């Protein structure tokens, strides 16, 4: 861990981070659309936080929880979402289950903390939102689910930008066995790959890609929907679509390619409620311990001396460096700010808000 600077001063009068207000927002997202907020340049209270959110457990990975109190960080990145009851054990670090395979992957290499907390069910509305642009482009609008149902993807699929799930109407017009539904595809996209063959008294046997469906496809190589695990920081690339439910039977070029709601596969849902409260997960990424201006106010930080006449590493109102401090009477402090800069942008001076004393800073 990087050590705290020998001379450290925080910026005064920063706003409160209000992390608790964000965690307790009654509009709670599902892991499918996990929400992220970055907290910077503000003061937080971990002890207050753990009391104001009905905390069930809190632990840290690659970091000592007790070292948060009183510390400063460059930023604290929070990710949150409601927990479907059946998926709770997916959230163990390193788990290959559905939540981390296909919704939210917990970074295990960073310094992080996982908060398990809950909100009163009667005030919680779950926000289930499909984050995949391509799904939405071809007909996915909303979920139609019970209150407190929490969506999760089992399997995600990615497509490139020429993807269209509908068969070409000209191809479909001569199929006699297993005619696929068809429609016009957007300009700049390729029609679904389809083949007509003869076989045992079927003169016009039509088979297209992604059969029986993209999850169970015989030949994944010929299915343009490609399996994708979510990486750190990513959302589900998309539900797989049953391409036999995109387009309409005998649809011509006057119908735009559209998948029905039930064509989107490989997801499910569960309530987040137990003991009449919605259970919720939140991940804390702690960036840049012992630096920055995202600082805990849990402790009365006893301000140390400004060591003078000696090369010293410092962290002054967010700005780091090393130099030799020499106290000076106020008349020689040529500015009104708490820091003093030269022509090339380097700090040459400092005013201490704790003592109102002024100092020159020289290089070592
Ligand atoms: C939660 O909902 C109940 C009834 O709908 C209401 O009486 C209560 O004030 C709400 N709580 C909050 C914090 O809004
Ligand atoms: C939503 O689902 C319910 C069943 O839970 C059903 O009765 C209703 O018709 C559905 N509404 C729409 C718009 O699909
Ligand atoms: C998308 O993948 C298909 C694979 O069949 C390919 O034909 C097409 O050119 C690709 N499009 C782009 C933009 O890479
Ligand atoms: C943070 O906790 C300390 C210790 O109890 C307390 O004195 C201080 O008022 C708290 N500040 C906030 C903003 O909650």
Author numbering: 311 to 674
What's in the article?
The human HKU1 coronavirus is a lineage A β-CoV and is comprised of three genotypes (A, B and C). CoVs enter cells through fusion of viral and cellular membranes, which is mediated by the interaction between the viral spike (S) glycoprotein and the host receptor. While S1 is responsible for receptor binding and recognition, S2 possesses all fusion machinery required for membrane fusion. Surprisingly, we recently found that the HKU1 virus, another lineage A β-CoV, uses its CTD, rather than its NTD, in the S protein to bind to its unknown receptor.
After removal of its 6xhis-tag, 1A-S310-677aa protein formed crystals in the C2221 space group with one molecule per asymmetric unit. The crystals diffracted to 1.9 Å resolution, and the structure of 1A-S310-677aa was solved using native single-wavelength anomalous diffraction (SAD) phasing. Native-SAD takes advantage of the weak anomalous signal of light elements naturally present in biological macromolecules such as sulfur and phosphorus. The construct 1A-SS310-677aa contains 24 cysteines. The anomalous scattering from sulfur and phosphorus is very weak and requires merging of multiple data sets from either multiple crystals or from a single crystal collected in multiple orientations. Accordingly, 16 data sets from two isomorphous crystals collected in multiple orientations were scaled and merged. The final dataset had an anomalous signal extending to ∼3.1 Å and its overall resolution was better than 2.3 Å (CC1/2 of highest-resolution shell: 89.4%). The structure consists of three subdomains: the core, the insertion or variable loop, and the SD-1.The core and insertion loop form the CTD of the HKU1 S1 subunit. The overall structure of 1A-S310-677aa resembles the shape of a two-arm ‘boomerang’ with the core and SD-1 subdomains in one arm and the insertion loop in the other arm. In summary, using a native-SAD method, we solved the structure of 1A-S310-677aa at a resolution of 1.9 Å, and determined the residues critical for receptor binding and neutralizing antibody binding.
